[PDB]
Design a protein around this ligand. Sequence first.
Ligand SMILES: [Zn+2]
Ligand SMILES: [Zn+2]
Ligand SMILES: [Zn+2]
Length: 178
Amino acid sequence: NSNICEVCNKWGRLFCCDTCPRSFHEHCHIPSVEANKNPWSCIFCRIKTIQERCPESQSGHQESEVLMRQMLPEEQLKCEFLLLKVYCDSKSCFFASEPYYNREGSQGPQKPMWLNKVKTSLNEQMYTRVEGFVQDMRLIFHNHKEFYREDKFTRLGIQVQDIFEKNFRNIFAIQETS
Ligand SMILES: [Zn+2]
Ligand SMILES: [Zn+2]
Ligand SMILES: [Zn+2]
């Protein structure tokens, strides 16, 4: 197996996947690495299995249909993996913990949002449809863009949003378009 965490790229107390060579810190994996289970399969492996079981699940889909899906176990897992993919980028540090807003010429957002809050919300089964998860994720980046206005720091939101959106289109097999 790898000797660094797949998400944060640091060594430490790592748990190894039994079906691929990836490794994770306990709370870097989503969901948090399960207490027992031998063998253990990581979230990348569990997603691959879903695809292999139902090859047709990779045919193109309309976003509007994806968003209305209820959060049954497979959709819950897909949102966990998509959240994980965002944490995999080092620029996610900017969006992880609860923000605060005190900048001359800007007002803070009405509904602040951050990755660790989405993470908790997923863990607590608070989202009933895919749409709830995707709306909170997009709100993170939209709040950022709106607050930082013309500061070049706004680009960090564009950058991590692009990682989110590309992974959303891949995981949920959104029909390709120009
Ligand atoms: Zn880690
Ligand atoms: Zn694995
Ligand atoms: Zn099938």
